[PDB]
Amino acid sequence: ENLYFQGDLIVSMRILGKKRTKTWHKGTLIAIQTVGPGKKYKVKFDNKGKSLLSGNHIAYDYHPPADKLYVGSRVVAKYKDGNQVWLYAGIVAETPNVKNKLRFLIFFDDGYASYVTQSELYPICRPLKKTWEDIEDISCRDFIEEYVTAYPNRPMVLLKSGQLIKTEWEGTWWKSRVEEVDGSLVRILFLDDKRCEWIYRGSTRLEPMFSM
Numbered sequence: 323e324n325l326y327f328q329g330d331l332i333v334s335m336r337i338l339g340k341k342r343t344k345t346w347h348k349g350t351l352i353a354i355q356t357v358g359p360g361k362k363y364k365v366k367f368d369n370k371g372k373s374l375l376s377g378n379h380i381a382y383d384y385h386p387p388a389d390k391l392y393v394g395s396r397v398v399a400k401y402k403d404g405n406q407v408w409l410y411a412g413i414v415a416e417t418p419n420v421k422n423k424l425r426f427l428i429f430f431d432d433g434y435a436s437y438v439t440q441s442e443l444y445p446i447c448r449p450l451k452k453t454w455e456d457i458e459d460i461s462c463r464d465f466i467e468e469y470v471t472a473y474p475n476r477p478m479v480l481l482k483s484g485q486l487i488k489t490e491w492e493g494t495w496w497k498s499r500v501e502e503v504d505g506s507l508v509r510i511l512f513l514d515d516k517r518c519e520w521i522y523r524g525s526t527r528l529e530p531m532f533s534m
């Protein structure tokens with residue numbers, strides 16, 4: 323059956339859709355198609371392509387009120403590294419409080435983390451009941467299930483700017499320096515290639531966490 327309405331979705335609404343690159347892109351909802359007890363959502367992307375997508379692979383083109391977002395909420399967020407932006411899927415790890423300077427902490431599906439504002443967050447339209455169950459990487463999937471279900475029980479390691487530690491990359495340990503602390507995140511400089519990454523202080527990418 324072709325529908326025009328399904329829950330709070332309406333054909334012709336602006337939407338975000340997931341592409342095979344795992345990045346999300348602006349489009350229009352052009353059809354809703356019931357297949358058994360299941361629904362599929364046809365997206366015409368603004369730039370290139372049309373996709374028939376499951377409800378967990380579309381996101382609203384508007385920002386969710388903070389009162390609707392919990393630890394474990396399934397979102398698309400802007401990830402910024404200061405020479406590239408992505409719209410990428412993740413999980414809300416913290417909601418705004420005085421300690422995080424009123425920001426949302428996002429754990430992205432690829433294991434990277436960022437603080438973002440509400441204007442950088444888009445709720446996924448039909449998430450799974452267990453929101454982590456559509457994360458591709460088994461390791462990121464298991465870590466999110468543990469973090470979300472055990473929250474607010476959160477082991478983190480305490481680190482100071484200048485501190486010299488081992489940080490993981492591609493399954494080995496690398497010499498690195500703690501540059502900066504910003505709430506539950508630490509900026510690590512890899513001394514080998516002078517590349518910086520923001521890492522969650524509870525991540526076992528940090529050798530002090532991996533052994534704690």
Ligand SMILES: CCN(CC)CCNC(=O)c1cc(NC(=O)N2CC[C@H](N(CC)CC)C2)ccc1Cl
Nearest residue numbers: 401408410430431432434491496512514515517519
């Ligand atoms: C949700 C966000 N997603 C969206 C997909 C992107 C996250 N970001 C990256 O994935 C990214 C990470 C690197 N990091 C490195 O290449 N390295 C770190 C140090 C390491 N070297 C090797 C000699 C020393 C140990 C190399 C580079 C570029 C990108 Cl874009």
